[PDB]
């Protein structure tokens, strides 16, 4: 019967789509930290300094 | 004379088709379970998570 294969290949299709989704979720995590830090650090740099009074 | 045998082998044809059907029906049943399970599980995985505040 044709049905048998249709079932089995569906199982595969789901699994592949899961793996594909995963990499984006993971990568978004990696980028989150890197981005946030870069902004903070850059801000502190511009904002700060010393001045010679006399 | 000929008639007698025709009947007998007919019986066998029936039973053999029946046995084969059983395989197909059963197998479809066995797969139904896992097919559903896989989809539900996979969705719950991709959708769920926690986030640091």
Nearest CA-CA partner of A11 in B44, B25, B47, B39: B39
Residue B46's CB is within 10 A of a number of other CB atoms, namely 14
Specify the 3-state DSSP secondary structure of A49: coil
A7 with B38: Cβ contact below 8 A:
no
Residue A18's CB is within 10 A of a number of other CB atoms, namely 16
Beta strands in chain B (DSSP E): none
B49 with A25: Cβ contact below 8 A:
yes
DSSP letter for A45, please. Answer: H
| Tokens encoding B16 | 């053999």
A18 with B49: Cβ contact below 8 A:
no
Method underlying the structure: cryo-EM
Q: Resolution in A for the shown PDB structure? A: 3.1
Q: Taking the CA atoms of chain A, what radius of gyration do you get in angstroms?
A: 25
Distances (CA, A) of A4 to A12, A40, B21, B25, B37: 13, 56, 13, 10, 16
Render A5-46 in DSSP notation, one character per residue: HHHHHHHHHHHHHHHHHHHHHHHHHHHHHHHHHHHHHHHHHH
């Amino acid at each position: 019967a044709i049905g048998i294969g249709t079932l089995i290949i569906f199982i595969a299709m789901v699994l592949v789509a899961a793996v594909a989704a995963a990499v984006l979720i993971n990568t978004s995590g990696f980028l989150q930290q890197k981005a946030m830090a870069t902004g903070k650090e850059s801000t502190e740099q511009v904002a700060s300094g010393l001045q010679v009074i006399r | 004379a000929i008639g007698i045998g025709t009947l007998i082998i007919f019986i066998a044809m029936v039973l053999v088709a029946a046995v084969a059907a059983a395989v197909l029906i059963n197998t479809s049943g066995f797969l139904q379970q896992k097919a559903m399970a896989t989809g539900k599980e996979s969705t719950e995985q991709v959708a769920s998570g926690l986030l640091c505040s």
